[model samples]
Each structure stands twice: as C-alpha cells, then as structure tokens.
Target: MNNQVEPRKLVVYGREGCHLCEEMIASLRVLQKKSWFELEVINIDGNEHLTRLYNDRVPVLFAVNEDKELCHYFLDSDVIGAYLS
Candidate 1:
C-alpha cells in the first residue's frame, strides 16, 4: 500500500476590510504552521471573475485536493485537518 501522500494546497477567497476574511487569514496561518501545504489568498474585491464568483462569500476557504470547497464565513478546522490527513 502507498502510505505516503503529498499535501494539498489551501486557498482563501476574500476581500479587504472584511472581519471574517481577516479572521480566516489568521486561522489559515495557524493551520499552515501545523500542516504541510501551500497557502494562497485571493482578493476578489477588484477582480472581475473572482468578484462574480465569490462576491458574497468574503471568507471562503477551498481545498485544492479535489477541487473541494472547505468552508465559508468561518474556518472549520476539523474538516480541513481531516482532508489533510
């Protein structure tokens, strides 16, 4: 059996001046320290495509593992960690 696996990337979709977005960014930093995965944040306020896609969900989190969405408006550490595992 193949026991070793590579980590998936974590993506945070957000905009400026958003409290929840800020909180998720912080949570992502914490998760980054504990997990081995790439991290990226996309600001959707000015971007045309991202804005239309995630305009209302300012703090959406996605797992690039299976193109799966992780959470929105808040950080769900449990699901995120489970996916990483």
Candidate 2:
C-alpha cells in the first residue's frame, strides 16, 4: 500500500489596482506556467470584509496544505515548495 499527500494549494490575496498585487500576479503566472502548484487568486478589494482584514497587506500568499502563510508580499517558490513537499 502507498500513501500520498495531495499537493497543497497556493492562494494569493491581492487587489486590482495595487502594484505589488500586479507583481504577485506575474509571479503566479510564471509558477503556473511551470505547473509548480495550484493557485487561487482572490482580490481583497472585491470582498469588503476581506479587504478590511487585509487592507494593509495586499498580495498575501497562503499555503493551504501546510496551513501557513508563506509571505505577504511575494511567493517564494523554494520556501513554498519545502512545505508543499
């Protein structure tokens, strides 16, 4: 018998008009291109409640499987990969 852990997901908390958010978008694009991991991009600006919660912290990155926040500014592939594996 073999046991396997499903790949964890990466969620990006961001907004449309933010520069850092745009940067994160680009990075996610790159990551997706290489099929590094799963990604879910959520705009804090879209949800009023989430916006307030992360108003000062856009472009946040969270790893669902590791249940940890990788970073709030950029997605470190190396760091994220460690926890994902």
Candidate 3:
C-alpha cells in the first residue's frame, strides 16, 4: 500500500456559523482559485458522522488519498498554498 502523501484531492470539513471555518474557506477559495485539484467543502454540523469527529473545531482539512489531516480554527495560508501548489 502506498502510504505516501498524495499531494492532491483535498477536502475541507466545515460547519455552518463557524467564523474560523468560514475564514478558512474564503482563504482557500482565494488561494486555490480553481486549480489542478478539487477543494471539496463539506458541511458537517448536522451530520452524525461529522459531528462526532469534528465537534467545535472546524475547517478541518483532509487529504483523502494520503489520509493526511490538516487541522484548523486558524489561518494556514502558507501551508495550504504549498499543499495546493
């Protein structure tokens, strides 16, 4: 099995009414600007699966293929930019 990071196919788990989550989405929208990879934003506030895992903290970024998690509730522009690029 290839455990190495895939470097693409990123997804963002977020909740409605979360300021940090909102900020992260906005930042990513600017940073990604519809590039080579897809940035999927999931609203997890009401979902049981999502609510269980990601409670209060939001903008939880995940790289699905690689199983890498980039946490949030703060701005990570440089890191996100590097990952996207």
Off by over 4 Å in 3: 1-7, 34-36
What is the per-residue lDDT of model 1 for residues 1-85, given as tens digits with 9 covering 90 to 100?
6777677887888776678877877887877787866767787877878778778876878778688777888777888877776
TM-score of each: 0.75, 0.64, 0.64
> Whole-model Cα lDDT per candidate?
0.78, 0.73, 0.70
What is the C-alpha lDDT profile of model 2 across 1-85, one tens digit per residue? Answer: 9977565678888777677767877887776675556777787777988788777876888777666668787556687555655
Model 1 misplaced stretches (Cα beyond 4 Å): 1-3
Q: Give the per-residue lDDT digits (tens) of candidate 3, residues 1-85.
A: 7664445777888866677767776776676664434678788866878778877666788766677776566866666566665
Cα RMSD (Å) per model?
2.4, 3.0, 5.4
Ranking by lDDT: 1, 2, 3
Ranking by TM-score: 1, 3, 2
Q: What count of clashes does model 3 give?
A: 0
Q: How does residue 33 of candidate 3 score in lDDT? A: 68
Worst 10 residues of 2 by lDDT: 76-85
Model 2 local distance difference test score: 0.73
